Design a protein around this ligand. Structure first.
Ligand SMILES: Nc1ncnc2c1ncn2[C@@H]1O[C@H](COP(=O)(O)OP(=O)(O)O)[C@@H](O)[C@H]1O
Ligand SMILES: Nc1ncnc2c1ncn2[C@@H]1O[C@H](COP(=O)(O)OP(=O)(O)O)[C@@H](O)[C@H]1O
Lengths: 192, 240, 172, 191, 421, 48
């Protein structure tokens, strides 16, 4: 009754977005009409309320639009792809990922840590958002890697789909063991 | 996993009347009805708790509680028992804000407060209270502050007077609502506490398997031991 | 009656409003004054007595105006009309001396009576000769209609009673 | 009713106005007058523009829309795509080529729905251009539509954009007569 | 013609974006408001077309009165929450769209769209915002603000006890609709050039209620006393004075003019002119001499001053029965009436109102009977509406209502058979 | 009952189908035989 009536009012890179836009649309239309009738073409957390799926869904299609006229990584429909893409594009120019001919992402979050003084350091928060980051594919630097911490970037909280892995320096004041058990990770998608 | 039978309740009811320890000396009618009125709850919980997984012993305890005060002085308002179950369920659609409180509350926090003032009449004057006496709600809405959140006594009294409800039990319930709204990790702490202010520090406490299987279970009723993966009850049986 | 019955309220099944609001003696005097004997007139006579709002009589055949004229002579009954201006004054006199005033040709009633009809021994009777006449909803609301136009049943009675009254004068 | 002279006058008055914008334009930009190139495209556009408002003014809305389409699907001179009723377009005195009305022309809390405020739209805009041509010629135009449609507003507003007009309202009734209208003069004018 | 929905959304979107500055806490609800006002307005305009009822014409004028009423309310309140903004939006929708409706079936459609639109655009609003009845009044608190049937009744009931000794000693049953009208009429009197058009059954309450509220606003009641010999020359006379006390005396007045009052077509025209703006021979002298006189207490400017008092000091309350053949054609006759006044449809008295009146008029009668058992057909009747197990008194009063209605229908039948009305 | 009343058929306004079809003694024994003591069951009992 009330539930459906509601939802209704809310309804080597170009290669990539082409499929996003494309795919999004098909889903736009698909769900657009499928509802009208009555009267997960992408990955998201097991449990997650309907209102949020919709709320988030709606925000993703907009993400989509802003892309047409022309990057919320964990908001795209195929994050894996966008990356495997940038691999070649970022490669089609200059050419192992690395953070800081390279792209920039926003919408990610630090889980179990915070970034103070160009490094990972302890916190009382379960997770804090990252406004943006620069990644670059290398071949060069990954040599001083025994003094840095490997932080995995998962599609989302569940920690069940790894997009890629990124190396970062950490507040050496704490043990490398204290860190390994802290289990810091990065979610590319965080709800609010 | 929670299939309970009428026969099972009737069995509890029988003992509430006859085999009630708490009631084996007095014979006065208007005296005995006192124990009878309250013991139905605790006695039912004693028998049901044996089937419930730990995270559900309080959940069912809250239901039993809400029912026991029904029709008494300290009976929980519907709007109040409602907010607990649905409160803020729509948060992701709240566009109203509370400017007057940016120096004190986050965005989501404000949103939540709008729900409270909006859904529950007892909290009609919460935003104005938070406004007038900021330094009490101070540490409450505050980040990394050692010390458990503290709902200001000033509020636990101001509101205890606005509504014609000066009851502890009801007061303890209004505390769950604030916690659901601003500290979800405290919901259990405070629920437990509320339940305990109706029955007793003890009602929610952990069972001789001797008696049960002996003089407390009719032979027509089997004994199941539904367990969690990897856990084997098999032993327990062979023992007895 | 069906409503009163389906709800549990008690009333008389052989009830007759007239014989419940008038004595068989007065009803008799009514007939002596040219009240046609037909339950329709007898019923109308009752409204002409216990009327709350004033009465506006629909009497095309004139059978009523005769009645009321006799029935009320006693109290100096006046017969005026909204025609000649001689009217207005009669109204003033009849509201001062409390006498019954019958006014013909309601067809054009000055609105300068609404406060009268809307409100001591005074009373007014509005009349019509038009059986096929139309009055506004306003008038309808401030009036107590009493319809004297005869139906085939009404006449059958008037005659039968008249017949007997002559044929079997003894039993009458 | 449709009468031949009623629409031709409405139309002549516009065409004329058109030409007056040239006289007027130069009169300012005397510096470097209008190019033959322009005084033709512009005028020839102002002709087609003039036909739709001079004869379509007295038509329904969708009517005038169909009617304008027609003009477009028959005209010679350059006309915007058959994907926007020539109605939605105007004619710029500079470029001299068609323009989109949408490209044409805030409030204070307390004057919000205040009677005298007029949020400008495509309608009010193209309306002042048309009424301007008729008011300049001092013709007796008639704004016709349902009550609330914007008539009283459209007028008092166009006249506001011309400080040389002193307007005086009057509300006719079933019994208005030469005299009433007359008396209303002897109280603003001088014989 | 009428601006389009897009054209409109843009016109009022601007108005609202600017009005919502008085409410920083609701800044994101502005375009929200515009979409709801523009949507409900369009829906009503298409559901209520003239072929159904003459006066069922609508225009952006509604959207404007709507926005101006919003602006006024908001200016007299220390803040407002979404629910506040939504209830205010519903209330004004009801005054500007529902009051005029004739059939209940038409008012329900309205009550339904209001709710429907409100949820489509104000999804986070709490339904408590739309709890019926949606009432408002400036009589029980400092400024405008919601009110409920009870508190309002205890009030009007008190203000009525004093109205009786003084003014009119006619007992008024405050049934639901009555409360609804002595509030709508109020709004009208609380405004400049405020004129009302009450159309309904005769003896339904239009005049007595118009009085009680003329009285509440300290307005003086006036009415021409027409008679079987009252000429179209008799009128301007009273007119000279009515306006006289309004402009010169600065005396607030409620002129309750009835449809029977127009004994001549010329009669409408006079009012039809004074209906809008505010307003010869030797007369024209004192009609300025007094001006001057009070003007005290340039010639032309002097007469504007008079015609400018009348306007914001005199109130016209027209009353009509939509059954007298001097009704429908009345609009085509005096187009300022159903076009300049606030039309409030009284209509008939509901079965619920009839229950009340019959109830209170028999409050002192002994209609008790402890030996009375309510029959099953009657226990069911109470169910749809009266004590848990219907009483003897209930049986009586409700049967007074039932009987009243049988006469309505017997009338329809009489008409469809002997053609008598 | 509304129907019977509407048709003019006389009946007991407050008729207990259970009393009309079983003696008070017949019931005491029903309960003694474990019939739950509620209106629903007593009604069911007469059906059985
Ligand atoms: N573009 C607009 N800007 C502001 N208000 C408008 C606009 N269009 C319509 N309106 C509103 O619609 C109403 C139209 O009334 P008006 O034009 O004065 O009467 P009529 O159309 O009967 O002559 C006005 O009250 C005004 O508030
Ligand atoms: N709400 C009410 N309760 C009780 N009596 C009423 C009510 N409304 C009207 N009446 C009675 O009915 C009469 C109605 O007259 P009035 O309202 O002045 O005329 P109209 O309704 O035709 O304009 C009054 O004299 C009054 O006594």
């Amino acid at each position: 009754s009330s539930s459906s009536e509601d939802k209704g009012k809310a309804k080597p890179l170009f290669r990539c977005f082409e499929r996003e836009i494309s795919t999004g649309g098909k889903l736009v239309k698909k769900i657009t009409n499928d509802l009208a009738n009555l009267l997960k073409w992408y990955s998201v957390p097991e449990t997650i309320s309907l209102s949020v799926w919709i709320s988030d869904f709606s925000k993703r299609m907009q993400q989509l639009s802003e892309i047409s006229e022309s990057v919320w990584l964990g908001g795209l429909l195929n994050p894996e792809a966008y990356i495997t893409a940038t691999r070649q594009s970022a490669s089609q120019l200059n050419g192992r990922l690395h953070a800081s001919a390279s792209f920039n992402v926003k919408g990610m979050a630090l889980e179990g840590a915070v970034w103070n003084n160009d490094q990972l350091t302890p916190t009382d928060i379960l997770s804090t958002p990252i406004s943006i980051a620069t990644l670059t594919w290398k071949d060069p630097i990954f040599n001083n890697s025994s003094s840095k911490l490997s932080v995995p970037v998962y599609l989302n909280e569940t920690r069940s789909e790894l997009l890629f892995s990124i190396d970062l320096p950490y507040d050496q004041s704490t043990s490398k063991q204290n860190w390994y058990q802290r289990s810091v990770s990065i979610s590319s998608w965080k709800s609010d | 996993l929670y299939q309970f039978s009428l026969r099972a309740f009737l069995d509890i009811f029988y003992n509430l009347l006859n085999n009630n320890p708490n009631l084996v000396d007095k014979k006065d009618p208007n005296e005995r009805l006192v124990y009878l009125s309250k013991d139905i709850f605790s006695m039912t919980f004693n028998r049901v708790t044996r089937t419930l997984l730990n995270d559900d012993k309080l959940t069912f305890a809250l239901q039993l509680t809400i029912i026991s005060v029904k029709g008494t002085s300290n009976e929980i308002e519907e709007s109040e028992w409602d907010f607990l179950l649905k409160g803020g369920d729509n948060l992701t659609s709240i566009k109203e804000t509370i400017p007057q409180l940016d120096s004190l509350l986050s965005t989501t926090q404000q949103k939540w407060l709008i729900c409270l003032r909006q859904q529950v009449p007892s909290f009609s004057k919460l935003v104005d209270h938070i406004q007038q006496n900021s330094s009490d709600w101070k540490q409450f809405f505050g980040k990394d502050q050692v010390g458990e959140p503290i709902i200001p006594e000033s509020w636990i009294v101001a509101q205890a007077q606005l509504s014609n409800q000066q009851s502890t039990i009801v007061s303890n319930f209004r505390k769950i609502l604030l916690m659901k709204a601003f500290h979800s990790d405290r919901v259990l702490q405070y629920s437990h506490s509320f339940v305990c202010s109706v029955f007793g520090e003890d009602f929610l406490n952990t069972l001789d398997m001797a008696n049960i299987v002996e003089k407390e279970v009719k032979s027509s009723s089997p004994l199941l031991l539904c367990s969690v993966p990897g856990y084997d009850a098999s032993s327990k049986v062979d023992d007895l | 009656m069906i409503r009163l019955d389906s709800v549990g309220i008690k009333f008389k099944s052989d009830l007759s409003v007239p014989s419940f609001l008038s004595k068989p003696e007065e009803r008799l005097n009514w007939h002596a004054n040219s009240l046609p004997s037909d339950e329709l007139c007898i019923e109308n006579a009752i409204m002409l007595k216990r009327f709350n709002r004033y009465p506006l009589v629909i009497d095309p055949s004139g059978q009523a105006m005769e009645f009321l004229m006799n029935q009320y002579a006693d109290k100096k009954i006046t017969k005026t009309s909204f025609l000649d201006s001689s009217f207005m004054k009669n109204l003033e006199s009849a509201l001062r001396f409390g006498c019954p005033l019958l006014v013909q040709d309601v067809e054009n009633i000055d609105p300068v009576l609404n406060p009268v009809l809307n409100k001591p021994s005074f009373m007014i009777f509005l009349f019509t000769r038009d059986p096929t006449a139309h009055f506004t909803p306003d008038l309808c609301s401030r009036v107590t209609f009493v319809n004297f136009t005869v139906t085939p049943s009404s006449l059958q009675s008037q005659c039968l009673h008249e017949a007997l009254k002559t044929e079997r004068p003894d039993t009458h | 009713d449709f009468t031949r002279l009623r629409v031709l006058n409405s139309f002549f008055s516009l065409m004329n106005r058109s030409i007056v914008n040239v006289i007027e334009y130069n009169q300012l930009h005397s510096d470097f007058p209008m190019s033959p190139e322009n005084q033709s495209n512009y005028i020839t556009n102002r002709l087609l523009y003039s036909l739709m408002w001079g004869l379509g003014g007295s038509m329904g809305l969708v009517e005038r829309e169909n009617f304008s389409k027609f003009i477009q699907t028959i005209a010679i001179t350059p006309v915007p795509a058959n994907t926007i009723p020539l109605l939605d377009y105007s004619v710029s005195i500079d470029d001299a080529n068609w323009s989109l009305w949408k490209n044409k022309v805030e409030v204070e809390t307390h004057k919000v729905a205040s009677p005298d405020v007029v949020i400008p739209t495509v309608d009010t805009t193209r309306h002042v251009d048309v009424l301007h041509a008729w008011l300049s010629e001092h013709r007796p135009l008639i704004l016709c539509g349902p009550p609330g449609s914007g008539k009283t507003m459209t007028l008092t507003s166009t006249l506001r954009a011309f400080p040389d007009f002193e307007v005086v309202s009057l509300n006719f009734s079933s019994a208005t007569t030469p005299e009433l209208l007359l008396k209303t003069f002897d109280h603003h004018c001088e014989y | 013609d009428f601006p389009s929905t897009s054209s409109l959304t843009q016109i009022y979107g601007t108005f609202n974006r600017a009005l919502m500055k008085l409410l920083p806490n609701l800044r994101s609800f502005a375009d929200n408001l515009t979409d709801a006002m523009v949507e409900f307005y369009s829906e009503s305009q298409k559901r209520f077309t003239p072929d159904i009822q003459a006066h069922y014409i609508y225009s952006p004028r509604e959207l404007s009165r709507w926005d101006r009423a919003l602006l006024e309310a908001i200016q007299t309140m220390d803040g407002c929450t979404l629910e506040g903004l939504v209830r205010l939006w519903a209330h004004e929708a009801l005054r500007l769209f529902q009051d005029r409706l004739v059939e209940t079936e038409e008012k329900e459609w309205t009550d339904k769209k209001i709710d429907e639109v409100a949820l489509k655009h104000f999804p986070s609003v709490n339904l408590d915002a739309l709890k019926r009845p949606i009432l408002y009044s400036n009589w029980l608190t400092k400024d405008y603000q919601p009110v409920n049937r009870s508190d309002l009744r205890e009030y009007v009931k008190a203000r009525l006890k004093v109205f009786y000794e003084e003014e009119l000693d006619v007992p008024l049953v405050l049934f639901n609709e009555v409360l609804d009208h002595i509030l709508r009429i109020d709004r009208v009197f609380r405004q400049p050039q405020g004129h009302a058009l009450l159309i309904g059954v005769s003896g339904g309450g239009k005049s007595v209620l118009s009085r009680f509220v003329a009285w509440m606003n300290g307005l003086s009641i006036y009415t021409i006393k027409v008679n079987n010999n009252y000429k179209s020359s008799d009128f301007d006379d009273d007119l000279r004075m009515l306006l006289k006390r309004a402009g010169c005396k600065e005396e607030k007045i409620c002129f309750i003019f009835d449809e029977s009052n127009v004994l001549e077509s010329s009669f409408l025209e006079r009012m039809n002119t004074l209906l809008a703006g505010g307003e010869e021979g030797e007369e024209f002298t004192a009609l300025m001499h007094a001006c001057k006189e009070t003007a005290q207490r340039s010639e032309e400017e002097l007469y504007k001053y008079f015609t400018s008092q009348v306007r914001r000091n005199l109130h016209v309350v027209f009353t009509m029965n939509p059954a007298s053949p001097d009704f429908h054609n009345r609009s085509a006759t005096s187009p300022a009436l159903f076009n300049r006044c606030v039309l409030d449809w009284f209509g008939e008295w509901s079965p619920e109102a009839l229950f009340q009146v019959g109830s209170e008029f028999t409050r002192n009668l002994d209609l008790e009977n402890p030996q009375y058992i309510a029959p099953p057909v009657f226990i069911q009747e109470a169910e749809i509406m009266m004590a848990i197990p219907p009483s003897h008194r209930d049986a009586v009063v409700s049967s007074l209502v039932y009987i009243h209605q049988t006469i309505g229908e017997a009338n329809i039948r009489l008409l469809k058979r002997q053609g008598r009305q």
